[PDB]
Design a protein around this ligand. Structure first.
Ligand code: W2B
Lengths: 300, 237
């Protein structure tokens, strides 16, 4: 079990760790989060009490280094940093543990929620969507725009998700216009799965990362990406059976985890009604359709 | 964006544009079968593709053989329309290709956009106008060439005859849409108006009769009256 320590907490802030969150008061005796499960990516995120504008945070994997948080009073935010001196880091964290100044990652043992939300998410893929190669961790916030959004403005701060556009030459084979527009299997299976992603695991990983950025930061371009990747599968008549079964599990846990009060802004009525009731895969998402109908029957 | 009453004069500026009407592409008669079920029989159709500035009409005849063995024909008809319009554009010299294509029905937007991906600079637009181009098959010479076709065929006509020698495009389009609206509302009466005076003939190379300026005013008044009549006969007013 790993630890992301904090040098201090000088400003009042709500801190998230994965699906958990807690309030820290201004200058409260706070030194961090311990007992973080090894084996998964994680996200530590922030919303300042004085400006709820800009949720921001950091994707990381404690297997890749020793990371800590330190507030920067010039840039006005909590920054993740790597400590390269392993002995120094271990000794400081051990003292914090002895003085019980760290919250414990509060994982219930029955609970597989975070595994289920991050099953295909890899740090190495995160770091190619979020380009900042001098760090091992990745910063995301509410305002960052996607490559696709920019095309329709600072490229160093973009989310480089894979561009999906159903009315593009990439999506539509010359001479197969009607076929390819009404059945997107060639775009899904040849262009995207064989061509760009290489396998369904990397496709699902980007889908899961897009949802999580939409949920945790309200990142609108991420929400657009998540829905596009769902729609591309559901609008394909020919999908490997193992992908459909896994998609149903992925979406089920995403819908389960969404705050009930954010459903109005994070769920696209058109996409979901099309996917569950009109698409080729209308009958292939039984768990997702059941949880959507019991939890958000209004949207449908 | 959408073409409507506010930007109506844009139709007659010097940027090449085409209206595309797909109403008459997939045409059927509905009949009873020996067992007492219902079936359809297709008949020849046509794409109505019109330059409103010049009157140039590209009438692509759709032969019933294109439907043979196909399913979901009303959906296919929109994609076949888009395929044929895209083929027409590619067949034109660059300086004759349109800068905008206006579709009379919104369901043509996605089929045409997808077929025109190679032409990103050609704008595909809907319209809020209720244009009467479905009545094109009430023009006898157009209906005749469609029904006689034994294979796919493109036939090129000026729908304004020689009117542009004497009137502007705006006025010519207004005459055309009044004639077609009349033929759509009461074809029998409209055709009676147009031919009641046998001494006014249709030239071999024309579609409409050879009315003088003064006769067109009378004709146009008679068509307005017809339209208002039918509107009363319909709504009782
Ligand atoms: O304080 C530092 C790095 N530093 C900045 C100025 C001088 N040393 N690092 C600690 C070790 C790990 C836990 C909290 C962060």
């Amino acid at each position: 079990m790993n630890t992301v320590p904090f040098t201090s907490a000088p400003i009042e802030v709500t801190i998230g760790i994965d699906q958990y969150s807690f309030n820290v008061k201004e200058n409260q005796p706070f030194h961090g989060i311990k007992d973080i499960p090894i084996g998964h990516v994680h996200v530590i995120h922030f919303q300042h009490a004085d400006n709820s504008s800009m949720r921001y945070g950091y994707w990381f994997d404690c297997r890749m280094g020793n990371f800590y948080i330190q507030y920067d009073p010039k840039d006005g935010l909590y920054k993740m940093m790597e400590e390269r001196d392993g002995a120094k880091f271990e000794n400081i964290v051990h003292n914090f543990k002895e003085r019980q100044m760290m919250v414990s990652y509060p994982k219930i043992d029955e609970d597989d929620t975070w595994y289920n939300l991050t099953e295909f998410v890899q740090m190495d893929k995160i770091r190619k969507i979020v380009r900042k190669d001098e760090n091992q961790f990745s910063y995301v916030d509410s305002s960052m725009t996607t490559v696709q959004e920019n095309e329709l403005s600072d490229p160093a701060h973009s989310l480089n998700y894979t561009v999906i556009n159903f009315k593009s030459r990439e999506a539509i084979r010359p001479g197969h216009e009607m076929e390819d527009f009404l059945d997107k299997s060639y775009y899904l299976n040849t262009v995207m799965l064989q061509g760009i992603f290489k396998n369904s695991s990397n496709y699902f990983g980007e889908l899961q990362f897009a949802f999580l950025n939409a949920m945790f930061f309200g990142n609108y371009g991420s929400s657009l990406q998540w829905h596009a990747m769902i729609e591309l599968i559901c609008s394909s008549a020919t999908v490997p059976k193992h992908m459909l079964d896994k998609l149903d599990e992925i979406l089920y846990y995403q819908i389960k985890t969404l705050p009930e009060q954010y459903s109005d802004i994070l769920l696209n009525e058109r996409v979901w009604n099309i996917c569950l009731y009109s698409s080729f895969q209308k009958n292939s998402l039984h768990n997702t359709e059941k949880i959507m109908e019991n939890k958000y029957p209004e949207l449908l | 964006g959408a073409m409507n009453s506010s930007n109506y004069a844009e139709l007659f500026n010097n940027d090449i544009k085409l209206f595309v009407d797909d109403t008459n592409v997939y045409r059927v008669t509905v009949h009873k079968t020996f067992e007492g079920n219902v079936a359809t029989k297709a008949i020849n159709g046509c794409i109505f593709t019109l330059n409103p500035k010049t009157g140039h009409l590209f009438l692509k005849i759709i032969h019933t053989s294109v439907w043979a063995g196909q399913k979901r024909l009303s959906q296919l008809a929109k994609w076949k329309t888009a395929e044929e319009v895209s083929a027409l554009v590619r067949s034109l010299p660059k300086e004759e290709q349109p800068k905008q294509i206006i579709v009379t029905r919104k369901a043509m937007l996605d089929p045409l956009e997808v077929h025109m991906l190679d032409f990103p600079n050609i704008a595909i637009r809907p319209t809020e106008l209720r244009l009467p181009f479905s009545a094109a098959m009430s023009i006898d010479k157009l209906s005749d060439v469609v029904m006689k076709a034994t294979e796919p065929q493109m036939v090129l006509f000026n729908i304004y005859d020689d009117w542009l020698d004497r009137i502007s495009s705006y006025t010519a389009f207004s005459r055309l849409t009044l004639l077609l609206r009349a033929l759509k509302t009461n074809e029998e009466s409209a055709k009676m108006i147009l031919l009641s005076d046998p001494t006014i003939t249709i030239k071999s190379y024309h579609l409409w009769p050879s009315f003088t300026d003064e006769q067109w005013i009378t004709i146009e008044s008679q068509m307005r009256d017809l339209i208002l009549t039918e509107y009363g006969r319909k709504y009782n007013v």
